[PDB]
Point group: C3
Chain length 112, copies 3
């Protein structure tokens, strides 16, 4: 049982971009760590307050991840912080060591 972090950005506050950018992040998180849905314990999503167009969880439902516990919140509101940012915390049952976990930072979130 370890936890994996993801982050990415969107250009615009639209449903399709929030969903598309999230799905890409979830897809990369799974591939890089060799995961399938039944390895995954839970997925927590946050968006910054400037995003309100859609639940990022839609992306997991698109992928067919309908048996996994999901939760969507807003990121802590810190003036001056990275805008238009979606973050993921995924708890996983895995045979890998914590040192070998691969956290995914995409698009504007590469600044962390």
């Amino acid at each position: 049982v370890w936890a994996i972090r993801g982050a990415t950005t969107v250009s615009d506050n639209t449903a399709d971009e929030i969903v598309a950018e999230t799905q890409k992040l979830l897809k990369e998180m799974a591939e890089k760590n060799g995961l399938e849905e039944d390895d995954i314990i839970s997925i927590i999503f946050t968006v910054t307050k400037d995003l309100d167009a859609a639940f990022p969880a839609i992306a997991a439902r698109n992928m067919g991840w309908t048996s996994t516990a999901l939760m969507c919140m807003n990121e802590i509101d810190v003036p001056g912080s990275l805008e238009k940012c979606i973050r993921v915390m995924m708890h996983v049952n895995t045979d890998k060591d914590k040192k070998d976990i691969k956290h995914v930072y995409l698009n504007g979130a590469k600044v962390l």
Copy 2:
């Protein structure tokens, strides 16, 4: 070993009695359908939608004697037009059931989710 259980429910009013009682029924339901006692529960994360502020849903767990469990409460992601008056619960548990056997619980207006 470790899996997570989701619950959701709705209330009629933004009041402390409704929030706490509907959260309590949801937790009881979640524990029953998954055969859980407090010993089995790792953590409980609560969210409420923006229209609910009258109390902490975490009081429900304390009422029913879950006084040794890590709790946390946030607001749900703000998305205008989403289900209103909604309490969600994410419960991490130690269990011998398979992921596919876990029963997630949707009550009241939350059945639509």
Copy 3:
């Protein structure tokens, strides 16, 4: 896998106060439970909405927890509750049984 709760308060909404008080809470959670970073699965931080000066997760980085999954949100907005409050939820891999986990309440958070 058990979860550990922490809470503390700050005197002011500043980056120094938020980081310093969170760092003190994390350190006391780690010592009272005999943890190194290798034992920590994830840390979730919340702040009451009157605080916005900094990410509490900076404190985890300052203690060298650079390989741990971190996430920050605001606390549920409930009028009539403790303000200037930082809360922590920590999932850990441990041999200690649930009843032997020590939860830590500091400063104005002792009220809780």
